[PDB]
Design an enzyme around this catalytic site. Structure first.
Site, PDB file in Angstrom:
ATOM      1  N   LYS A 146      86.633   1.588  28.193  1.00  0.00           N
ATOM      2  CA  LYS A 146      87.505   0.947  29.194  1.00  0.00           C
ATOM      3  C   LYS A 146      88.994   1.153  28.862  1.00  0.00           C
ATOM      4  O   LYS A 146      89.353   1.386  27.681  1.00  0.00           O
ATOM      5  CB  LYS A 146      87.104  -0.522  29.316  1.00  0.00           C
ATOM      6  CG  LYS A 146      87.504  -1.391  28.142  1.00  0.00           C
ATOM      7  CD  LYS A 146      87.676  -2.843  28.514  1.00  0.00           C
ATOM      8  CE  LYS A 146      88.141  -3.676  27.339  1.00  0.00           C
ATOM      9  NZ  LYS A 146      87.596  -5.043  27.435  1.00  0.00           N
ATOM     10  N   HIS A 149      84.213   7.018  14.110  1.00  0.00           N
ATOM     11  CA  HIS A 149      84.969   8.248  14.443  1.00  0.00           C
ATOM     12  C   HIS A 149      85.554   8.821  13.151  1.00  0.00           C
ATOM     13  O   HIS A 149      85.525  10.050  13.010  1.00  0.00           O
ATOM     14  CB  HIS A 149      86.096   7.972  15.451  1.00  0.00           C
ATOM     15  CG  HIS A 149      85.720   8.081  16.888  1.00  0.00           C
ATOM     16  ND1 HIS A 149      84.922   7.145  17.524  1.00  0.00           N
ATOM     17  CD2 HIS A 149      86.084   8.975  17.839  1.00  0.00           C
ATOM     18  CE1 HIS A 149      84.772   7.481  18.794  1.00  0.00           C
ATOM     19  NE2 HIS A 149      85.500   8.590  19.022  1.00  0.00           N
TER      20      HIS A 149
END
Lengths: 193, 282
Positions: A104, A36
């Site tokens: 998650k 990222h």
């Protein structure tokens, strides 16, 4: 309502209310924090990625891979805790015009404004289910930044079949299933404590 | 020869979920009503079939290597020291051939050891058993970060009693929510000192699902706590559901008259363990 997509157009993204079931059959890209950060550095600067994330699907995960007969085989790719990208995921959505994040645990409430303004959905993957999701990987197309970041932190480009079930847990309509359950849980706990 | 048995023990624990846990997951599935949690549970049950068929770890976070060692009669202390080295070596070898993820780091530097061995990493618990005769028992207990990061301790006032215990258990499960990946197994340690209370809470997690405390009175507190925990509505992955926990295990020890230490160790649905008894050369 359960859905199956091969691609996710913004049109379809806004058609995913919290609690819907999703299966994916197309392309997905892996990215953890290191990835990222590198992606943001290079798009902010005008470096060309060797891949396109416009309307794409990002999976928060570190795939275990084995080189077998001069191709890659996946052994386990469970989902990473998404809240690790809490501080970079706004910048990430605004530079890339991704359609979906999979992982998650969920992500902070603030980003739900970002998911309504840009058309974006968060899909919960069965936590722990490394073998199931591995078995869904049909082919490994390409891997990026391998030498720099190493095998788990690298961006792996995958083709998946019946990658799911996934739960729509934060939508583009301002709703988060995590925020909902935590308020109900507070209420039922007071009635016991 | 123990290092190679240790490798097979971590392979067992990493791939094959104990049968008592698979059964409890099948039961959880037939008992709940939430469509979201029913879907999550079949995916988990499907995960476990595929892990075993394709021989890959059922869970990617294979954990920190914890080892429980029971030692029988008529074993030299010098041989126990060689058994502890072979257990380390077998964890080094298991990282390589299972494979396990290298997860053990220096707490301040964060430097990965690359073999899960270092700075007292193979946490080895030692007990003596007079009912074994040149025979050791090895339990491999691979513990994940997600579940261990929800551990809690509390030094209650004794006058808080059983009500304050129940309240601390419920607060802790509620606070954790979906983060130690329910459904979950709760280990409760009551008594000792603070370190003993947390040791007990972990030891409580070695038990099989449905295995009640051999003291009927504490067996009753285990079932009151399972019923109240299932009332919370956390469900599979904290997405909402009727089944938040598969079971509740309590273990106790003597405590100071002015104290009541309580420890909690949560385990995620991936209760993983493997046990082997080993007869030693005569």
């Amino acid at each position: 309502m359960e859905y199956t997509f091969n691609k996710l157009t913004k049109k379809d993204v806004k058609k995913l209310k919290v609690g819907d079931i999703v299966y994916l059959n197309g392309k997905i890209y892996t990215a953890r924090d290191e990835a990222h950060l590198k992606i943001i550095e290079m798009l902010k600067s005008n470096e060309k990625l060797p891949f396109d994330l416009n309307e794409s699907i990002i999976y928060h995960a570190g795939p275990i891979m084995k080189k077998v007969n001069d191709s890659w085989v996946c052994v386990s790719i469970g989902p990473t805790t998404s809240a690790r990208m809490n501080d970079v995921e706004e910048e990430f959505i605004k530079l890339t015009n991704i359609s979906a994040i999979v992982g998650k645990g969920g992500m902070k409430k603030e980003l739900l404004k970002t998911f309504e303004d840009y058309g974006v959905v968060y899909l919960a993957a069965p936590g722990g289910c490394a073998a199931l999701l591995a078995n869904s990987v049909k082919r490994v197309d390409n891997v990026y930044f391998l030498d720099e970041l190493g095998m788990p932190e690298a961006v792996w480009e995958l083709e998946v079949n019946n990658f799911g079930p996934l739960i729509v847990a934060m939508d583009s309509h301002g709703n988060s299933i995590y925020e909902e359950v935590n308020k109900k849980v507070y209420e039922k706990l007071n009635e016991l404590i | 020869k123990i290092s190679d048995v240790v490798v097979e023990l971590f392979r067992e624990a990493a791939i094959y979920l104990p049968e008592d846990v698979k059964n409890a997951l099948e039961e959880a599935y037939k008992k709940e009503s939430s469509e979201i949690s029913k879907n999550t549970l079949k995916a988990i049950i499907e995960n476990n079939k595929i892990a075993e068929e394709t021989q890959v770890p059922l869970c990617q976070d294979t954990g920190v290597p914890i080892v429980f060692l029971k030692i029988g009669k008529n074993i030299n202390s010098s041989e126990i020291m060689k058994i502890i080295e072979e257990i380390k070596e077998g964890v080094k070898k298991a990282t390589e051939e299972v494979p396990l993820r290298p997860n053990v780091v220096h707490p301040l530097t964060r430097e990965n050891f690359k073999t899960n061995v270092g700075l007292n990493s193979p946490f080895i618990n030692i007990e003596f058993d007079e009912s074994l005769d040149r025979e050791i028992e090895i339990i491999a207990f691979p513990k994940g970060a997600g579940s261990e990061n929800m551990s809690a301790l509390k030094m209650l006032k004794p006058s808080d009693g059983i009500e304050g215990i129940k309240n601390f258990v419920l607060e802790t499960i509620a606070n954790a929510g979906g983060k130690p990946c329910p459904p979950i197994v709760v280990g409760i340690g009551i008594g000792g000192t603070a370190d003993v209370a947390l040791k007990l809470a972990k030891k409580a997690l070695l038990r099989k699902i449905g295995e009640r405390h051999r003291d009927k009175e504490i067996a009753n507190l285990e079932k009151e706590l399972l019923e109240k925990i299932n009332s919370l509505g956390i469900g599979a992955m904290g997405l909402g559901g009727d089944i938040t926990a598969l079971d509740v295990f309590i273990e106790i020890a003597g405590c100071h008259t002015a104290s009541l230490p309580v420890g909690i160790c949560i385990q995620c649905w991936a209760d993983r363990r493997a046990i082997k008894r080993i007869k030693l050369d005569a």
